[PDB]
Symmetry: D2
Subunit: 225 residues, 4 copies
């Protein structure tokens, strides 16, 4: 219980959202390894299923506590535990679609469990584009830049994301994030990178829309001396 | 009761929202003149007041039924009444802030009353910018382009907005809107312009954050023969 | 010779440019009516023809002297004559392509002739998009907002343009312009609109790529009292 | 003379350009180490000096031949030598300024020398922003994503750049690049990253505006297995 965290934890999720008028509620449960930056989770659509849009748009909405940090970069995210942190992100897709997500991350030390409460809102997905036609095929691995805002004790993230398409295409999406510990820390990192790789697998059956998501993320500094 | 509408109507509002973690609920009541494109309303912050951000960001979120349409342009908005229409908009401010709003417009013919239910979400307003410092001073009058999407029986709006600043500055914001009648009409307009002018006046006292908003809007076609 | 201008003038053009590595020089001659805001011109590709891209991208590059101004809005452009004005514009297409153009406008009072020297540079047009496939079909009429920068005695223009496609599509392009009289005037307009309508007709034969362009433009203030 | 390249080479530059009406010509000479991804060069303003804008805007305009590639990623850039490659880039600054640059890279094997010919065009830098006030302080190290376009045998680059400000600020700039070998190769890389670090030092005296630039760049694949 280094910040209320252990090497292997469980996770619970609740998301509420609305994309172009369609409302939904998703719940999920998972297992993660904070110090390795690995998590695996299972989502279940509990109201508003089947979703009219690609599951993939929600991937990055479903916790930077799961990042591998080297000893020599301040870990803002684990340092905020157990009370945790919140974040707010915009998604700017290349075809005009725009999303906002918010989450609240909190630890129950007694249950050894991370709690995740999020809101997802999206507008203006083209009726005929690959999101609404469900023709996407996962996000490409990425490199996010994390930038301290020292007067405020918050972080920004900047990542140019590429949603891969079933037909061999790619659809660009610009992510801009604000990360806020519930207590603004005296101890802040320098700017650094976080690299991410996701997987996603639909496991839907006749009763429920369900899928399985994975992330592996590792922090680092610049490769140049 | 041309589409359930009269020359002078009353209006009720409820908005729920969240801007950078701060949640709020606003209610409002007003009087409008659908055929002149004029409305005047009074808002009252009912949870989460005082707001930490400029009232002005919510102005365009608080009904295209109030637009003056010439006989010779199809009025998509009045034609959708009484059941009404919904819209979804993104706000892209020049300093990185991003908002989404949604509203649902409906007529009660018996009460001669327009009902307005909206959601407003905003992220990434700079702590030190004029929105969070409440240094704005109304939107400049504008010209919006309205564009039919004929295969879908919906409209898009495109307007480059300028929020005027107390210090003499201007802050650009890009509005992209989707307008959707609850029944997709066979009768659709050609592309046209809608010009808008707003006013806003804080009328806050010690019990409640309150203000007064006005819009005057007129549709037209291109000035060139 | 109100500012060296007459009711009917002739015009000469020279453009040099480079779009994704392809260099070109175009010359042109035309007739215009400054006080009616009308001009008609003929372009001839003189080096680098046939062009690999749609003629339409160059339309707005080929003089705000040809705008109809009401008595009650300062005419920055005619006021700058005969020495004239320069402008610098960015074109941001929705598919990632980016252009810059520059022009220099000057009057020869003895010849009753407007001289136009421009540079056009474009990058990153998709090999398979409608510009490089020459599947465009003129720009839609528009409304440009003109905004004074009073400390500097220059103007900005902001117009969201739509290039119409042969297949019934539309391709958005964002125009941001800086307009600079060669002497910064004491007399400046308030913000206003300029509406534009263009036509274009290829008149290419076996010796030369040639086409005919027209603009009709009219300034106005807000429609709302 | 692996592709006409040696471990240590010399470099010559000529740039012509125009930023908001101000024309310039810069020449330069340098020493580089293609296999280590290191170069050091000296620029001299030869027409239009002193420049009215920050030297820093031209840094990335002044050769991906100087990148360290691991054996296991195809080196598109060295593979294009000696004939070389060209590139076209847009710069989208957060305050509205827009630049385009083009370069042509070629090797003289007899002289053991890389030749660099470039064009730089910029519009709409705010008169009062840090570029025109010359208040910038170098670019932050970055990570560029390099993406193959297989049907075309070209590469794209995508990097979100941050120009550091003397006052402790940062000014964002979005770089989108197209890289084109003069012969489209059968052998293409997979997507990868290139990390960059620059330095810049003014060495201006009374006769000439002069400065010294350095780059160190290294290619890599994703950190996640």
């Amino acid at each position: 219980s280094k910040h209320g965290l252990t090497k292997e934890m469980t996770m619970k999720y609740r998301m509420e959202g609305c994309v172009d008028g369609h409302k939904f509620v998703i719940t999920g449960e998972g297992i993660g390894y904070p110090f390795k930056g690995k998590q695996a989770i299972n989502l279940c659509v509990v109201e508003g299923g089947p979703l009219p849009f690609a599951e993939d748009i929600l991937s990055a909405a479903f916790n930077r506590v799961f990042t591998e940090y080297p000893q020599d970069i301040v870990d803002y995210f684990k340092n905020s535990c157990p009370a945790g942190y919140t974040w707010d992100r915009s998604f700017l897709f290349e075809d005009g679609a725009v999303c906002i997500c918010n989450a609240d991350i909190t630890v129950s030390v007694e249950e050894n469990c991370m709690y995740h409460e999020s809101k997802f809102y999206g507008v203006n997905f083209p009726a005929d584009g690959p999101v609404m036609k469900k023709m996407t095929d996962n996000w490409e691995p990425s490199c996010e830049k994390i930038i301290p805002v020292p007067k405020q004790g918050i972080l920004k993230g900047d990542v140019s994301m590429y949603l891969l398409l079933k037909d061999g295409g790619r659809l660009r999406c610009q992510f801009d994030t604000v990360y806020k510990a519930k207590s603004v820390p005296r101890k802040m990192p320098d700017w650094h990178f976080i690299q991410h790789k996701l997987t996603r697998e639909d496991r839907s059956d006749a009763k429920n829309q369900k899928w399985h998501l994975t992330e592996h993320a590792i922090a680092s500094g610049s490769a140049l001396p």
